[PDB]
């Protein structure tokens, strides 16, 4: 449709923005909308009482925390909203492959934004852990040894292997400059979520293989 050169104008502005990238007011409104209606006409109600609770959490989060004072409600919001069951339509929105949806790419520019948003004291330095179910000609396909990855997904990671983890088919190891955490703004804080925005670059180092899980252990290190 036109969803797909949204798409690529969405991601020709991630990499040329970079971390400047900011929602506007409108994409914002249609980030509301897409949140609100993303089930259906029949859960709009209940998904509004979700959004209006959110953005209450919100704007009293920035109360609590004048660090965020000049970070966009609703950008947040979106931080709250990834760590719900929602990040499945917008994890890969960006992914080559991907048939692109219009709340998907709503969802992305918020989260997006508040990534870059955020102050930098929200940054984790240090190893990252994720798990992902995914193919072996999935993991050619994006990662090499001694080659730079560009990720084209909202890349999920955690600051522990806590309770939340469960051992999966893929696992990394990311070395975290600017990975932002986002505990603080999800559902389930205790995860300590680290989610790097599509267009960061790593310099993967290693790819392990075992017959055990996890099939590939990718060892990579965010670079600017």
């Known amino acids: 449709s036109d969803l797909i050169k949204q798409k690529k104008q969405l991601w020709q502005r991630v990499q040329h923005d ?10 914002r409104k249609q980030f509301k909308t897409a949140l609100i209606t993303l089930w259906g006409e029949q859960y709009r109600p209940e998904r509004q009482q979700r959004w209006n609770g959110m953005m209450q959490r919100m704007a009293q989060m920035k109360w ?19 760590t719900t069951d929602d990040y499945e339509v917008v994890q890969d929105v960006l992914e080559k492959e991907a048939r692109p949806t219009a709340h998907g790419l709503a969802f992305a520019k918020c989260i997006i934004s508040a990534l870059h948003s955020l102050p930098e004291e929200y940054s984790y330095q240090g190893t990252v852990f994720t798990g992902e179910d995914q193919l072996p000609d999935w993991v050619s396909e994006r990662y090499q040894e001694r080659s730079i990855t560009t ?29 932002k955490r986002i505990s603080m703004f999800s559902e389930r ?22 017959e055990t899980h996890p099939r590939l252990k990718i060892y990579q290190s965010q670079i600017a």
Do not use: C
């Open 18 to 27: 970079g971390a400047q990238f900011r929602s506007t007011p409108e994409e």
């Open 64 to 82: 609590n925390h004048p660090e965020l004072k000049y970070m966009a409600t609703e950008d947040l919001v979106a931080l709250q909203a990834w």
């Open 189 to 210: 804080p205790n995860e300590q979520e680290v989610l790097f925005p599509p267009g960061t670059r790593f310099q993967v180092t290693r790819i392990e293989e075992n």
């Open 151 to 179: 990720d084209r997904r909202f890349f999920a990671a955690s600051e522990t292997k806590n309770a939340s983890w469960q051992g999966m088919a893929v696992e990394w190891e990311s070395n975290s400059t600017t990975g």
